[PDB]
Design a protein around this motif. Structure first.
Motif, PDB file in Angstrom:
ATOM      1  N   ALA A  48      42.394  60.981  76.224  1.00  0.00           N
ATOM      2  CA  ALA A  48      43.638  61.281  75.534  1.00  0.00           C
ATOM      3  C   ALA A  48      44.778  60.401  76.006  1.00  0.00           C
ATOM      4  O   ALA A  48      45.580  59.924  75.202  1.00  0.00           O
ATOM      5  CB  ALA A  48      44.004  62.725  75.736  1.00  0.00           C
ATOM      6  N   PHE A  49      44.857  60.195  77.314  1.00  0.00           N
ATOM      7  CA  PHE A  49      46.038  59.573  77.903  1.00  0.00           C
ATOM      8  C   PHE A  49      45.800  58.120  78.318  1.00  0.00           C
ATOM      9  O   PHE A  49      46.638  57.503  78.977  1.00  0.00           O
ATOM     10  CB  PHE A  49      46.568  60.437  79.051  1.00  0.00           C
ATOM     11  N   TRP A  50      44.657  57.583  77.904  1.00  0.00           N
ATOM     12  CA  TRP A  50      44.355  56.165  78.066  1.00  0.00           C
ATOM     13  C   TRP A  50      45.416  55.320  77.369  1.00  0.00           C
ATOM     14  O   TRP A  50      45.989  55.736  76.363  1.00  0.00           O
ATOM     15  CB  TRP A  50      42.970  55.865  77.489  1.00  0.00           C
ATOM     16  N   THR A  51      45.688  54.143  77.921  1.00  0.00           N
ATOM     17  CA  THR A  51      46.670  53.237  77.339  1.00  0.00           C
ATOM     18  C   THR A  51      45.972  52.060  76.679  1.00  0.00           C
ATOM     19  O   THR A  51      45.231  51.324  77.323  1.00  0.00           O
ATOM     20  CB  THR A  51      47.669  52.721  78.387  1.00  0.00           C
ATOM     21  N   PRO A  52      46.210  51.884  75.377  1.00  0.00           N
ATOM     22  CA  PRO A  52      45.489  50.893  74.576  1.00  0.00           C
ATOM     23  C   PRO A  52      46.051  49.480  74.675  1.00  0.00           C
ATOM     24  O   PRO A  52      45.471  48.572  74.093  1.00  0.00           O
ATOM     25  CB  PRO A  52      45.649  51.424  73.149  1.00  0.00           C
ATOM     26  N   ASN A  53      47.147  49.289  75.395  1.00  0.00           N
ATOM     27  CA  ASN A  53      47.726  47.953  75.500  1.00  0.00           C
ATOM     28  C   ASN A  53      47.040  47.066  76.541  1.00  0.00           C
ATOM     29  O   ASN A  53      47.666  46.615  77.503  1.00  0.00           O
ATOM     30  CB  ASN A  53      49.239  48.021  75.732  1.00  0.00           C
ATOM     31  N   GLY A  54      45.749  46.813  76.336  1.00  0.00           N
ATOM     32  CA  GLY A  54      44.982  45.959  77.226  1.00  0.00           C
ATOM     33  C   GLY A  54      44.347  44.778  76.513  1.00  0.00           C
ATOM     34  O   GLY A  54      44.528  44.599  75.308  1.00  0.00           O
ATOM     35  N   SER A  55      43.602  43.970  77.263  1.00  0.00           N
ATOM     36  CA  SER A  55      42.892  42.827  76.692  1.00  0.00           C
ATOM     37  C   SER A  55      41.784  43.292  75.747  1.00  0.00           C
ATOM     38  O   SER A  55      41.584  44.491  75.554  1.00  0.00           O
ATOM     39  CB  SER A  55      42.305  41.941  77.798  1.00  0.00           C
ATOM     40  N   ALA A  56      41.066  42.337  75.161  1.00  0.00           N
ATOM     41  CA  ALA A  56      39.938  42.651  74.293  1.00  0.00           C
ATOM     42  C   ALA A  56      38.839  43.374  75.071  1.00  0.00           C
ATOM     43  O   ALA A  56      37.894  43.900  74.481  1.00  0.00           O
ATOM     44  CB  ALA A  56      39.396  41.385  73.649  1.00  0.00           C
ATOM     45  N   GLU A  57      38.982  43.394  76.397  1.00  0.00           N
ATOM     46  CA  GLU A  57      38.001  44.002  77.301  1.00  0.00           C
ATOM     47  C   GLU A  57      38.301  45.476  77.597  1.00  0.00           C
ATOM     48  O   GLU A  57      37.469  46.185  78.164  1.00  0.00           O
ATOM     49  CB  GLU A  57      37.928  43.202  78.611  1.00  0.00           C
ATOM     50  N   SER A  92      50.007  48.403  62.898  1.00  0.00           N
ATOM     51  CA  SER A  92      50.373  47.157  62.244  1.00  0.00           C
ATOM     52  C   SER A  92      49.355  46.057  62.536  1.00  0.00           C
ATOM     53  O   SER A  92      49.374  44.993  61.909  1.00  0.00           O
ATOM     54  CB  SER A  92      51.768  46.739  62.686  1.00  0.00           C
ATOM     55  N   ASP A  93      48.472  46.336  63.495  1.00  0.00           N
ATOM     56  CA  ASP A  93      47.407  45.423  63.890  1.00  0.00           C
ATOM     57  C   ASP A  93      46.081  45.931  63.342  1.00  0.00           C
ATOM     58  O   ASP A  93      45.562  46.940  63.818  1.00  0.00           O
ATOM     59  CB  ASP A  93      47.345  45.313  65.412  1.00  0.00           C
ATOM     60  N   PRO A  94      45.535  45.226  62.339  1.00  0.00           N
ATOM     61  CA  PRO A  94      44.333  45.629  61.607  1.00  0.00           C
ATOM     62  C   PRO A  94      43.236  46.143  62.526  1.00  0.00           C
ATOM     63  O   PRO A  94      42.687  47.225  62.306  1.00  0.00           O
ATOM     64  CB  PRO A  94      43.887  44.325  60.952  1.00  0.00           C
ATOM     65  N   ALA A  95      42.923  45.365  63.552  1.00  0.00           N
ATOM     66  CA  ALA A  95      41.835  45.695  64.456  1.00  0.00           C
ATOM     67  C   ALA A  95      42.024  47.057  65.099  1.00  0.00           C
ATOM     68  O   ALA A  95      41.099  47.873  65.130  1.00  0.00           O
ATOM     69  CB  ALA A  95      41.708  44.630  65.526  1.00  0.00           C
ATOM     70  N   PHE A  96      43.221  47.298  65.625  1.00  0.00           N
ATOM     71  CA  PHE A  96      43.493  48.545  66.322  1.00  0.00           C
ATOM     72  C   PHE A  96      43.482  49.730  65.349  1.00  0.00           C
ATOM     73  O   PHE A  96      43.100  50.849  65.711  1.00  0.00           O
ATOM     74  CB  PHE A  96      44.813  48.474  67.100  1.00  0.00           C
ATOM     75  N   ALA A  97      43.894  49.473  64.110  1.00  0.00           N
ATOM     76  CA  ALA A  97      43.878  50.495  63.072  1.00  0.00           C
ATOM     77  C   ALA A  97      42.444  50.905  62.758  1.00  0.00           C
ATOM     78  O   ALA A  97      42.138  52.095  62.691  1.00  0.00           O
ATOM     79  CB  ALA A  97      44.582  49.994  61.829  1.00  0.00           C
ATOM     80  N   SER A  98      41.570  49.915  62.566  1.00  0.00           N
ATOM     81  CA  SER A  98      40.145  50.171  62.348  1.00  0.00           C
ATOM     82  C   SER A  98      39.544  50.944  63.515  1.00  0.00           C
ATOM     83  O   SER A  98      38.854  51.962  63.333  1.00  0.00           O
ATOM     84  CB  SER A  98      39.377  48.860  62.184  1.00  0.00           C
TER      85      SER A  98
END
Lengths: 640, 628
Positions: A48-57, A92-98
């Motif tokens: 739940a509280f993970w932060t998605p602002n990381g690299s492709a990794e 707003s970022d296709p990949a993250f939306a998918s």
């Protein structure tokens, strides 16, 4: 307090150690702080509280909120499942939306798996189109009912997509109404909105003409921030006059739950003011074990036929573990086996691979494997039908026993033979398989109730999108709404299905039942699982034949076997109710008539179905034949 | 225990007292004092029920005369099980008598429905009863009421009218039941049930286990018990009655067969016992006020008698109010006697107006069972007189929504120039609303299987499908049919998007110049917030006579009333509105050769002048058509 329920929302504030693991003690303490239910992140706090602002990794943490740690009815009462806040299908970022669509789906699926009665989903934009689409199809195509709290933002300015230069005529209500439209205006009995109050009260929440709207809307909850002071008496934590006047204003019934939301990095009064907020808020508006045992006996016997050879270690595979009372059971069977057979000599050790498809099931299996099984078993994520490859690939050895329990009331209705059959290329010719054999039986019955009841099933507006049991799937109509259509007609569709019924107001027309379809594993020769037979009976009275009652018995191993057939019914067992193969129209018979039930079990590139019908013959040899029902599984088609 | 088992009393000629059809309560009080709760009583009454036709056309059936008033509807509803006149043979070998039988079977069903009965029994007197079955079929399938039905059987196959021991191949009481049950469409066994009739000699199929088990798979509802015993019950009788008694929801009725009468009245109890051992006051008030007012006005003249026509007596409270208001005028302002004419078309209500004109009015009022539309012609043939005043009430929650104007315009034919219509006038109103709840609820309306044949509210009527099953088709779509109708609702979870209503359609009576009833008005409304307009709450006001009047309108509402909940003229989809939006509710009230309908919709025009319009709802009354 009996009438006010005060939910406490999980936060990044009370993230203790292994909280996902100890939800029990959590709701225990919380409860001690005089409040009942909780809004917990369904996926787990480490997710739940993970932060998605990381690299492709940087990928999202897999779901990790075990069910087993709490008996079901409890989950249902207390826990209100909320979607991970980092999820944003309208990114707003296709990949993250998918990515977010994918994971939104995963969390919806898991909420269904845990079986919660209520769910929260918090909007973070002024427009959430994609979120809407996903949620809309979800809710419209579920065969159950559940509630949904759409929690709104504090005010418009908090919305990701907010430009103070384009918010022409927008407000919190417009947001809610827009989402409500977009999900297709599902019944507010189940599709509800939750307001979020904070320190700064928006005008549309105080100006009467606007707070009035929320009365003509499915308001389910107020989400209240700890944005408040400690004025009066012993620094009594309380709530402003406009706040009060608001909550008071919109509190129409005591089913309107209230969730408190920790915003302030207050460890409180060292975790005591919780109950203080509780009160503040409150006075402002005032299992079938027999089957499993049998399995155990089967196992022990199996370990006895091989163990005698003086074996040491043996490879057992559980195919479709579920939550795994059969894993626990197998282990216990090794223990009993050693306790009675290997007295004063070398113990036999069993290695247990459990294979499963449903990822939620897996979630439970890992927890079981940690707490109870002590890391003993190898958990494998695949449908058994794909094992062979990844088995020898990832370096595992072929099994000796393959244990499965994929039985329907009509035996093979629940796809057992295809599942077990998919795993033959990876077995020793030695591999004994449990169950070894099972057989599906049938017996003609008469009941106006069973028939009349099957026929008169109807689909209410709210269930118009629920997927059919046949080859058809829901679709979009002209009004961009989901509809499960039925070209063959509703009655037709109602009558071309096997069912699972508690036979009550009926009567037999045969003294005993006949064998229909047998299956034996391992199917080393790969005989076709599809069948085709006639099953004939003889009527001894003037009667109305509404169809056949279907059964099955099943030998796990040799002598060990359990049965649902009336003549040999495992006493007290409830794990199965009989199947029913219904006739479209009650067929009439008299003393002397011979009845030939024609049933074919057809198999498809993608599914499996029954096509049945009847041929009546009087003594004069003259014969009639009802129409072939379920032509092409159009009304009943079990897929894979 | 005792009260767990329910015992009923079937009426018979054995117990035909006098004026009984006008004394039921006491009958069941007596029946009750003999310890048995429910009763089976022929609904036309005894005089009708046990009539025996053998003569020519000379013998026409005793009119139904079992009035409701004698008992409050919940007494009827609780104790009286209605039953069809045994003499009705819808499958008579005589064509004429079968037609007659259909007509009366209908009148009778209609009456069961009238009295508001919860259960009803019907005795099968044949091995095959196809016409009966067709009538019954269409009946239960097109009823929007949910009532119970007992199909009572014959003692044995042997005593059927069509019994011929020469082609009774493999037929039995059950083959009969299953034939009839099949012939009414297999209506849910939860409503459509069968009753067994245990005679003195016990049939084979009620003893032969294998056979008797048949009834455990049938909707067994009751056991009819012929008085063919001694107070005792034989071995096989007992073993049967136990064998098929699975639930305690079962009922059992006493059949007076053997004893001309029970020698000891206490035996009447020995049998039951032995077996167990197995409203809008204000509408009327205000009307009386307008009436006293009219007798002040017209009476002041100087006359001593005035004739008034109540056009639609109903059960007649407005009548007793006319005569209790004439009673109370001769003392405050005077004499001035009043001659009352109560016209009515509902034939079942006429029973109530007769029993009323007897038990109340002292025959001082001449009842008239005729559509108040052809009264002009029957005004001379029966030596009547022109009316000085005509008192009516044919209005709905939207006022004109029940067709008042057309029928009153029917009475316009023979009216004097001096005839004042009470009520004189009415007007309809309308008020923009917002509520998910209501809209969602209207849209979600669904028709389950058992309601597939309920007629539509429009031009459409039920029809036979490919399986010879009655069905009401909605070719415009279920949802459209749902949204193109006016409703009456208790506004539960909603909000008003205006502060005050607005005028729509007025009507002026007596419509003397016979002006068209077709109307076409456009209403305008301005909005003051971000909202979702779902439709319009519909209202009305009516002036009965000068000063006095009554109205359901928001502000001007007759207080304490429950006579009319508000209407809703909903839209197909909610309309998003904001501050300063102009809305035109466009309503045409169209009329047809046979009915009347509404065609409404909405136009939206914003601050900028942009003009959109919702689609025309209810085109040609397809979803909504009040038939005349």
């Amino acid at each position: 307090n009996s009438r006010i329920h005060i939910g406490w929302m999980a936060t990044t504030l009370d993230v203790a150690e292994n909280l996902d693991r100890h939800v029990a003690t959590f709701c225990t303490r919380l409860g001690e702080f005089k409040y009942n239910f909780v809004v917990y992140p369904i996926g787990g706090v480490v997710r739940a509280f993970w932060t998605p602002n990381g690299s492709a990794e940087n990928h999202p943490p897999v779901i990790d909120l075990p069910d087993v740690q709490l008996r079901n009815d409890l989950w249902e009462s207390y826990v209100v499942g909320k979607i991970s806040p980092w999820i944003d299908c309208d990114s707003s970022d296709p990949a993250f939306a998918s990515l977010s669509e994918e994971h939104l789906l995963k969390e919806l699926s898991y909420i269904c798996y845990l079986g919660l009665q209520t769910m929260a989903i918090e909007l973070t934009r002024i427009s959430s189109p994609r979120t809407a689409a996903i949620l809309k199809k979800w809710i419209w195509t579920r065969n159950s009912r559940f509630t949904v709290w759409v929690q709104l933002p504090s005010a418009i300015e908090k919305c990701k997509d907010y430009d103070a230069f384009t918010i022409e005529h927008v407000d919190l209500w417009t947001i809610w109404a827009d989402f409500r439209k977009n999900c297709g205006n599902f019944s507010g009995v189940y599709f509800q909105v939750a307001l979020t109050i904070s320190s700064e009260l928006p005008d549309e929440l105080t100006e009467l003409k606007l707070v009035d709207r929320w009365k003509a809307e499915p308001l389910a909850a107020f989400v209240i921030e700890s944005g408040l002071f400690i004025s009066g008496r012993n620094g009594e934590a309380s709530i402003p006059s406009a706040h009060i006047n608001l909550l008071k204003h919109l509190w129409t019934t005591d089913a309107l739950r209230i969730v408190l939301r920790a915003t302030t990095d207050t460890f409180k009064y060292n975790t005591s003011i919780k109950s203080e907020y509780s009160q503040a808020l409150r006075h402002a508006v005032r299992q079938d074990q027999i089957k499993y045992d049998v399995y155990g006996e089967a196992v022990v016997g199996a370990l006895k036929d091989l163990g005698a050879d003086g074996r040491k270690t043996v490879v057992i595979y559980l195919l479709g573990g579920g939550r795994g009372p059969i894993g626990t059971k197998i282990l216990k069977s090794e223990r009993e086996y050693n306790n009675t057979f290997r007295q004063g000599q070398e113990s036999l050790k069993v290695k247990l691979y459990i294979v499963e498809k449903n990822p939620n099931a897996i979630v439970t299996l890992k927890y079981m494997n940690v707490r109870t099984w002590k890391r003993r078993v190898t958990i494998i994520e695949s449908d058994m039908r794909s094992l062979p490859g990844i088995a020898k690939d990832r370096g595992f050895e072929q099994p000796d026993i393959i244990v499965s329990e994929l039985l329907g009331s009509f035996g093979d209705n629940e796809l057992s033979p295809e599942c077990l059959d998919g795993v033959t290329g990876f077995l020793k010719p030695t591999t004994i398989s449990i169950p070894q054999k099972y057989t599906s039986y049938v017996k003609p019955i008469m009941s106006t109730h069973i028939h009349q009841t099957i026929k008169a099933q109807s689909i209410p507006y709210l269930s118009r999108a629920i997927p059919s049991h046949g080859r058809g799937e829901p679709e979009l109509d002209e009004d961009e709404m989901w509809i499960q259509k039925y070209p063959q007609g509703h009655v037709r569709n109602n009558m071309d299905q096997i069912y699972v019924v508690y036979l009550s107001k009926y009567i037999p027309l045969a003294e005993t039942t006949k064998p229909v379809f047998t299956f034996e594993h391992p199917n080393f020769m790969n005989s076709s699982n599809e069948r085709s037979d006639s099953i004939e009976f003889v009527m001894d009275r003037n009667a109305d034949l509404m169809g056949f009652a279907g059964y099955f018995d099943l030998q796990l191993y040799k002598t060990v076997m359990l049965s649902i057939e009336p003549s040999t019914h495992t006493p007290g067992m409830v794990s199965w109710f009989p199947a029913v193969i219904p006739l479209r129209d009650q067929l009439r018979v008299g003393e002397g008539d011979r009845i030939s039930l024609k049933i074919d079990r057809k198999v498809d590139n993608t599914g499996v179905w029954y096509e049945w019908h009847v041929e009546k013959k009087k003594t004069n040899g003259e014969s009639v034949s009802t129409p072939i029902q379920n032509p092409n599984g159009e009304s009943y088609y079990m897929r894979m």
